[PDB]
Every structure is written in C-alpha cells, then in structure tokens.
Design a protein around this nucleic acid. Structure first.
Ligand SMILES: [Mg+2]
Ligand SMILES: [Mg+2]
Lengths: 106, 61, 167, 127, 122, 197
RNA sequence: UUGGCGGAAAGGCCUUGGGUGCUUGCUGGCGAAUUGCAAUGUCAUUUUGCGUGGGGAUAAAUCAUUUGUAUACGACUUAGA
RNA sequence: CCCUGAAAAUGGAUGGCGCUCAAGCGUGUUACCUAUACUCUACCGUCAGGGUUGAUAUGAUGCCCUGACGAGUAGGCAGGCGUGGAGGUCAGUGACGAAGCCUAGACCGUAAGGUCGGGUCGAACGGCCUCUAGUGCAGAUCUUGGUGGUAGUAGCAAAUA
RNA sequence: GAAUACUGCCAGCUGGGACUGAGGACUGCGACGUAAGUCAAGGAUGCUGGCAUAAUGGUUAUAUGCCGCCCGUCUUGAAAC
RNA sequence: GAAAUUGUUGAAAGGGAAGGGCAUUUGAUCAGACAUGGUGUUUUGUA
C-alpha cells in the first residue's frame, strides 16, 4: 500500500526531573493516542527506538538507532517513563521516536 | 538517620594481641588462645588476658 | 628485582559451581494462540504479513506458513512474542505437521574463514511446502475474501490506536 | 587465558582533580583536600566536584586486576620472570622501563616458552 | 597588535580598518626574501613557481636602557628585537588521491538484503 | 498529528491560548496563529489600557534604547505573552520559538488552509456571560498600532473570496450527498451498514 | 496544452483538449523461501563541489590622483579615456 | 468578599508570563510529581560477636561466618603515599642508553601516588627490610630570579628656524 | 422476605510491567510421592541469533538539558562595596 | 634545557566573560580478549 508503519509515533518530552534537578537515566515519552494511564498500561514493556542519521557510514548504513523500553506510566495524562541502553542526548526534546508492538500480549 | 543511643564504631577498649614484639610471647599467646578457644575452662581465658598486659599491670610477685 | 614478591600466591584451581535448582517446565502459551489462527508478523523480513499458525515447536517457537502460493511466505518458525493473534480462525485439521521439528531447520553454521566479500534451496523443503499449502488453501476457499486478506499486508493508518483496536 | 572472574566494575572511573587546578597553573591537579573555612568543595555544595572517599573502593574479588584479568607484576630479568611459572593465570609480567632491548628479547623468549603473558611486548623493539 | 592605532582607507583591500606602513620591518623582511630567492637560484629552483610557504617571527632577547622619571625614579627603555625565518617552495601540482580501502562489515541480514535487491532488480 | 497547525485567533483568550501554544511548541508541534487582531482579554478595556500604560512606563533610565521594548501590534503582544511562558534564553527555547509565526489577518500562504480552534481557551466557553472583555485590535490601536484599517479592508476582501469559494463547495457537496443517498440501499450499502459504515 | 483568477508574504488555485501509464469495480495464471526466531534493516530533503551536453550575457568596485557643500583619523560629497 | 480611607523619590516585580463560573478567596474529596529521608539488594570501610594449627604450601597480624553502623569546623588518634642521606639484601637496572624533561597514549590504587609505551637526552640509578632528617606549599603587602596584559599605548611640545 | 452499598478477612485464583542473579562440591528446614525419586526447599539457569571488530567500551574536544558566585583568613555571620 | 610568556602550523568552539559537575549525541583517538588442552592425524619438515 502507501503506508507501511508498524509502530506508534511518540515524542521525547524531557528527562525525569524535579523543579531544578533532572535525571537523564529516565526519559519521558508522550505516545500519541493515549490520554490516560489505563490506556497507557497497554504499552508497558514495549520496545522504543530512536532513529537518527549521521554523515559517516559505519557498518553499511548512515542511520543509527538507540534502543529502550517502556517501564511505567507517568502522571495522569498517558505520558510514560522509558529507559534506554544509552540515555537520550537531550537535544532530542520534542523529537519523534518509535514505539513498537513487540513484545506483544495479543 | 538514626537516633543513636551510644557512640558508634567505638573500640572495646580492652587490649588484645599484646603490643610487645617478643616472638616467644607471641608463641605463648598462640598456645593459650587455642586453649582458651577450645578447652572451655576459665583458667585459660584468665591467663590469656593476663598475657596481654603491660609492665605496670604485671607487678612482680 | 623490580617488584619484590607477593607473600602469598592465590590458588589457580577453579572451583565447581553449586548444584542449581532451576528445572525447565514447558512454556505456557497465551490463550489466543490455538493452531489454525491467522497471525500478523510484527517484525522480521515478512513483517506486516498475515500467516497461519500450525504447530507449537520444541524451542517455544510457532510453526507458521503463508501459504506460499498466497503471499510468498514459506514454511517457517517465528517467535510468539513477535506476532499478533487475530480473531480470524481457519481449521488446520488434515495437515501432517509432525514431520517438522527443531532439527528440521538447521543453518549449517559458517566458519570464520569464509568471508563473503561480494556474494540454493532444499528440495525437501520445497515439496514439503507444496504438500502443506495445497491442504491449507482448500480450507481457505470456504469462507470468502480470505485469500485476498492473507495476500494483503497489515499496516497502521492515521488515527489507529492499538490499545483500542481489536484484532 | 586468565582465571574466571566476575565483571569488573569501577565505581568512579573519572580522575579526582584538585579544585582550581584548571584555574591556576601553580595548582597541580594531584588531589589535595580543601581545608578552607568557606570552601564549597569541602562543604559539598550541589554542582561542585566530588571528593575521594572509602565508598568508591573497588571489589576485593576485582581489585588490582587488569582488564585482561591478571595482576601486573614488574620483572627485570629472567630470574624475576621465572617466579610466575606456576601462577600464569593470575599474574602477567611487565618488563621494567629501564631494561635494554637485547635483554628484552631474552625475557620475551623465556616468557613465550613458559607461557607467561607480557603486557608490554613492544618496548624498544626495532623493525 | 593593533589597539589604538589610526584608521585608514588602505585597509579596505583586506577588510580591516587598522593598517600601517612599518618601513623598517619591510626593509628587513624584503632583505630576507632576496636572500631566500638567491638561495633558491643557487639550489637550482624554477624561480617562477615560488611562493612563501613558511614564515615566522618570534622574540629575541631584549636590549635594555634606562628612563628617568619624576621624583628621581628609574624605569626601563627596552628594545624588543626579532628572530625571523622563512621558507620558499615551488608550487606543485595536486597532492595525492587513492584513499584507504575502507573494508566493510555487514551482518547476515544486510547481506541477505543486498542479495535480495540484486535478485529483485537487474 | 499534524505537520503545521493553523489556529484562528478570533474569540480566544490571550493567556490561555499562549499557555496551550507554548506547550505545543515545546513538545515540537509547529503552530501558526492567524487573525491576531481578534484575540480577547478578560476585563474592562480601561483596565487593560491602564495595564499597558503601566507596562509602557518601564524603561531603562540611562538609555531608553536598551530597555524593555513595548511592541504595539496584536501579534507582537501575543508573542510577548508567549515568550513569557517559554524559557527563551536557552537554545531549546530558541528552537521552540522558531516553530511559531503569528499574523494579523490571514496571509495568502494560509488563507487556503484549514483553521482550528482551542476549546479550552475560547471566550464563550471560559467566561461567565456578563463579564466584560476587550478586543486586542482595539487595545493595540489605542496604544499605537497604525494598521488597523488596512487589515480590516484586506479581511473584507478575503472574506468575499472565501464566500465565493464556499458557495461552490456547498453545491458540490450537495451533489455528492444526493448521489450517495441515491446509491445507498443497495446490497453493498446494507452490508456496510451492518458492518458499521 | 487552452483559458482564467490570485499582490497581505501574490509563487498558488481552477479549468479546456489530446497523449500515456495504472486500475483492487469483477474473475484467473506464474513468481516470492536462505534476511535462517528480532535487530531503523536503510526508500526523506538540505547545501556544495566536480564532470558531461544544451542554452544564455559579455561588468563594476576599491586603492592611488582630485574636490571641499565634508572632515581628528576613518567616513562623506565631487571630478578624471 | 470588594471599595473609600491609602502620598516618595532610576523602571519593576503574587518569582515571571499571565489569570476573572480563575490559574483569586473559603472548604471538601481523590489521583498524580519527587529528597542524599524510609524499604529491599549489591559493593567499600569501621566496629562488634564468633569459627578455624590437621595433614599439603605458603601468609594465625591469615582465612572464613554473622550483625549493626557511616554528616562534621577547632581538635585528637590510626593506617598509608612521597623526598635527601645511612646499614643490609636483590651476585638489581644501565653507553645495545641511567637520571631528568615532554607526551587531550595505555594500566593499577578511593586517594596521596605507582607502572608502561613514544620522543628528547647523555652517566649514573632503583625495589624490599630497617635507620635518620634542614622531608611535601597557592597564599605570609613572603625572598631571589624571570615573564605578561596594559601597549606599539602615555609620550619623545620651554630656550624664535 | 431479599438484594446491594460500606468496612473487614481468605495459609482464593490469575494477567501485564520494571529492577536485581549476590553466592559457588555436599551438609539444613521442607514439600509431592507407598517407594525409587522429584521439586519453585540455605541467592539463575536453559535455548537461540548477530558480531568478533572501534561494534560495546575507555579517554578527550564540542553540543544539548539541569545545576554550579573566588579562593585563603578573621568572624555570630563573606560572593561581598 | 621545565614553567610563566610568545611565533607558525593543525584541530575545535565563540549573540554582554571564561572555567566546572551528572548524563548522552557527534568527531577524533585507543587498550584488552579472540589461539584455548580437545575426538583428531582429512598431515607435511614424520614424530
Ligand atoms: Mg594546573
Ligand atoms: Mg623623564
């Protein structure tokens, strides 16, 4: 067809933070479509990929991926907490990111 | 935080393993620490503690 | 001497591990996976394609087929955590899948010397595929539009919420 | 070829540098504790440099081990090298910096015969 | 070294405003340029492709005199002399080409994808 | 969900719209706000004129040129209210603010596009009926904006052209609705009705 | 390709005619495997350079000289085949 | 509750934007955010309580088991790192290159520090057990010596040329 | 004559998610079993894939998010005008 | 033949200082493990 998307779009909002101290080890993700923790409970444990590009070709590609997963819900509005192998570079606040449907329970 | 009722990390204040560098005294306290550990007699513990003592705590008899 | 010595050397004998208590009970699959279910492949080379599930294998994998005449997916095994069990059900009674096992799919592992600088199929595999898919498509022809459904790919459109979608 | 060990973890892999060693050239970056009465580093304010303490200490099963898994032992000649004959899987030899090349070839030959690992088998070598 | 010097129209060539005419420096530099051209023709160079490839100036030891200031004080009056060196070379052609081999590492999935593309197209 | 979101600023409250839009930019949504002369501020016109005069008094004493700049256009008033809610002095704030452009009227890049509203910042949904409000264009031309009438003339021309568009669109959709109704009650229509479409 | 309309930042919208390709509106035939149980598995647009081969056109500014409606110096205003 | 009473000097502060059935005031119910605090786990150290001379191989100040604890100026104590020189030892290193110096190169230690590779260089130096002291610097308007910014700056204009 | 709400109990069942895997022959307390034996009972094992190299990682420079006042001294109090 | 301080070359950043801490992107640079004993001799220098 014309669409081939097998993931859900999301936005990298910020780190986990207090009013004046942030914590880069936990990122905050807005998954689009979900507006409550009860709907966000479907997406727990799903893999997340941040997909970006670079000028230098490394192993056949100019596209590099950072992997992570959803761990828990955050707040009352469907924001989730996500942890990555290496933390997200904080210039990606507001950048798009992919939530895959695996590991599936359905 | 703990509301400590005592001084933390304090030494017991009783001298063990005597401050002398006498090798025969160290052999004697090795023998008597074996005896105090395993013979379950109070005499061995008493003489083991008396072996640690300094000169002014060991008056001549 | 430059360095003097260590007064004690550590022993070089390696100790044995303790006797473990982790036995292997078999995998308890989720309830939506019954044999004959149409699955959607979430990842892999054939991602977004709808296949039919036949047999639960020994290494917790699912035996699936396209059929190969419909969408070009061969006889294959997939992971149960990488599929979506749709509610669409066909009957796979009349297919002899006990031939396939974990030794049926062997990669014939490659040596470190054989490096592909620049750059085939088992005949046993191809007539096994031809035996099973002609038994599947006879069950496919009963209810309408299943051949078209299995040939078409799955993809998420704008406005599709997977937490609200029923498959 | 080393003895099996747990995963080596460094609690603080960054070097502890003296406060204002970046600021003044007369202040070397060897660690000194701030004994000042108003020092933010001594008072441990947020956003300042961290200080060395006993909590950063390495695991006793992991301490003094190279990433290869051996402990470095400095050697000066063949008789010093031969002390590691029965302890090859725990210690690795390192030729001292002041050994000449014509002795270094002898030490490397004897270590290769005895199966001993040398951590610097490239010093003063001509090609 | 240009703070508080005068401004001039002849810096428009170089996009600056502050420019001067250091006659003594020009005399010394052009004497060294003449000597280097003489060395080049003695060595047997082309004498038409020469460009000044290297030049640097750094400080010689100072030469000190005295200055007499009010209320009977002495200050310094020091000359700051120069060490100058320069190298003229012939302008050659393009330097080099044929860079590194850049050996590639591909996974089995990448190799299967490239083989699939090579099969699926011509 | 959208590449660019075009917001019709008419009938909106300035602070509530700015707090919606600033969060949208910080999340990464591109926003363009049109018709900035029709924003509303709650309160009397005299109260908001006094507020702007209190703001207009504030300037740097030794040099007025480096003081706070008092911008007079309604779009720049909205930009001031939004820059107050974005941390504009950082690189993240600058990158957020470059995803925004605010206009008086609807310029020709955006007069053929779709305009949306924000229902949690709409005056008729937020204020109690009876409370008094202002128009940002009236306040701005009271404090020194020069282009209130040329925007009105351009908006009149644009509305005439848009009504000419809408008449044709309405005629076409009535033809399409007539054909859909006559092509309904067939077998595919009843099967789609059973399946929910 | 024909005809319009659009100046707020128009640079876009509509329309006439023919060509050409596809059509999943409906019914068929062949292909796909081996990326080995997943690895973004690579499909977008931004700028520049160098080659082709096809058009298009053949300038000024500054320094120096000069002026004094200008001027600390720069700058400004003039003149000079 | 709101309003009058209610006047100060640079421009101005419920923190700012702003907010009017509030994003105000009174009150109630839930959900949610996060401290070096609490719970669980790992690791480091300290303290305490214990086990273990049996043969083989070492270290009994050793090895092992268990539990609790960890803020800190003035100050006290303990364990260590480094320097000049001395007794002993490694029949230590070295002109096939000692010492020194440079090195956004590598390794070890929580740290003081230690080790290696490369460059430069040219004649002595090191590990360990002990002994000894003119033994560790950022400051003292510290001492001696050297060098900057200021800065191509102030200026080099009395005595007719 | 019932139901339901509210509160409380179950040594009732069961689904999803995250972090941790310390220890290293055996010894103990138990459970299911007539027994052999088995087990979730004094701390993680089994199966599989890719790569085997700057890919992970270390160092260093830069960028981004948040934080960070100049040290020493006297002082009740120092970033101190 | 050190440092202060300086010249050239190279790399990098720079909207009213610079420097630092935690974390990661990007660029540059770099260490370690990769054999192992092994059924085995498909073997040459026959062990
Ligand atoms: Mg320094
Ligand atoms: Mg004078």
């Amino acid at each position: 067809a014309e669409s081939h998307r097998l993931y859900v779009k999301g936005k990298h909002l910020s780190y986990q933070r207090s009013k004046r101290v942030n914590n880069p080890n936990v990122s905050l993700i807005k998954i689009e479509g979900v507006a409550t923790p009860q709907d966000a409970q479907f997406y727990l444990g799903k893999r997340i990929a941040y997909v970006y590009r670079a000028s230098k070709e490394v192993r056949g590609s100019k596209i590099r991926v950072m992997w992570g997963k959803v761990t828990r819900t955050h707040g009352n509005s469907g924001v989730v907490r996500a942890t990555f192998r290496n933390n997200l570079p904080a210039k990606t606040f507001g950048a798009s990111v992919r939530i895959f449907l695996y590991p599936s329970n359905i | 935080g703990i509301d400590h009722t005592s001084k933390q990390h304090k030494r017991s204040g009783h001298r063990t393993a005597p401050k002398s560098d006498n090798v025969y005294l160290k052999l004697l306290v090795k023998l008597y620490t074996f005896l105090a550990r395993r013979t379950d007699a109070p005499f061995n513990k008493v003489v083991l503690k008396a072996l640690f003592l300094s000169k002014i705590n060991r008056p001549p008899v | 001497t430059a360095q003097q010595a260590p007064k004690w050397y550590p022993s070089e004998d390696v100790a044995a591990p303790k006797k473990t208590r982790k036995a292997v009970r078999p995998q308890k699959l989720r309830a939506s996976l019954v044999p004959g279910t149409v699955l959607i492949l979430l990842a892999g080379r054939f991602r977004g394609k709808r296949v039919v599930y036949l047999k639960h294998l020994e290494d917790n994998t699912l035996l699936v087929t396209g059929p190969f005449k419909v969408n070009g997916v061969p006889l294959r095994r997939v992971n149960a955590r990488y599929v979506i069990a749709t509610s669409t059900k066909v009957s796979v009674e009349g297919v002899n899948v006990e031939k396939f096992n974990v030794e049926y799919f062997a990669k014939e592992k490659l040596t470190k010397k054989e490096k592909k600088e620049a750059n085939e199929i088992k005949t046993e595999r191809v007539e096994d595929q031809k035996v099973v898919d002609k038994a599947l498509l006879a069950e496919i022809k009963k209810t309408p539009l299943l051949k078209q459904y299995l040939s078409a790919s799955f993809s998420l459109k704008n406005g599709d919420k997977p937490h609200l979608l029923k498959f | 070829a080393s003895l099996p060990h747990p995963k080596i973890v460094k609690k603080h892999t960054k070097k502890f540098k003296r406060h204002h060693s970046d600021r003044y050239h007369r202040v070397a970056e060897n660690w000194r504790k701030q004994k000042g009465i108003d020092s933010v580093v001594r008072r441990r304010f947020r956003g300042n440099i961290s200080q060395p303490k006993i909590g950063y200490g390495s695991n006793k099963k992991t301490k003094f081990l190279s990433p290869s898994g051996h402990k470095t032992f400095l050697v000066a000649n063949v008789k010093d090298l031969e002390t590691l004959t029965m302890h090859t899987k725990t210690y690795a030899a390192e030729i001292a910096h002041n050994i000449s090349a014509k002795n270094r070839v002898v030490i490397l030959a004897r270590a290769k015969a005895l199966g001993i690992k040398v951590t610097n088998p490239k010093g003063r070598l001509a090609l | 070294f240009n703070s508080s010097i005068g401004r001039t129209a002849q810096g428009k060539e170089f996009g600056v405003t502050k420019a001067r005419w250091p006659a003594k420096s020009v005399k010394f530099v052009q004497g060294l340029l003449q000597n280097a051209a003489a060395n080049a023709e003695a060595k047997g160079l082309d004498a038409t492709k020469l460009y000044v490839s290297h030049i640097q100036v750094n400080q010689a030891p100072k030469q000190r005199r005295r200055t007499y200031r009010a209320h009977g004080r002495i200050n310094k009056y020091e000359s700051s002399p120069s060490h100058i060196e320069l190298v003229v070379t012939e302008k050659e052609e393009a330097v080099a080409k044929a860079a590194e081999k850049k050996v590639v590492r591909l996974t089995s999935r990448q190799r299967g994808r490239i083989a699939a593309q090579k099969r699926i197209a011509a | 969900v959208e590449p660019v979101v075009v917001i019709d600023g008419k009938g909106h409250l300035v602070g509530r719209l700015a707090s919606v839009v600033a969060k949208q930019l910080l999340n990464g949504q591109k926003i363009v706000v049109v018709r900035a002369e029709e924003l509303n501020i709650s309160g009397e016109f005299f109260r908001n004129k006094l507020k702007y005069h209190d703001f207009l008094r504030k300037a740097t004493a030794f040099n007025k040129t480096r003081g706070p700049f008092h911008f007079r256009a309604p779009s720049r008033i909205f930009y001031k209210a939004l820059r107050g809610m974005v941390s504009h002095k950082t690189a993240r704030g600058k990158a957020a603010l470059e995803r925004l452009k605010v206009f008086e009227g609807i310029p020709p890049p955006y007069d053929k596009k779709k305009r949306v509203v924000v229902p949690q910042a709409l005056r008729v949904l937020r204020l109690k009926p009876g409370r008094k409000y202002t128009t940002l264009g009236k306040l701005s031309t009271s404090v020194g904006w020069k282009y209130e009438d040329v925007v009105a003339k351009l908006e009149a021309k644009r509305k005439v052209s848009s009504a000419e568009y809408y008449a044709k669109k309405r005629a076409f959709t009535k033809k399409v609705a007539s054909a859909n109704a006559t092509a309904a009650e067939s077998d595919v229509a009843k099967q789609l009705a059973a399946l929910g479409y």
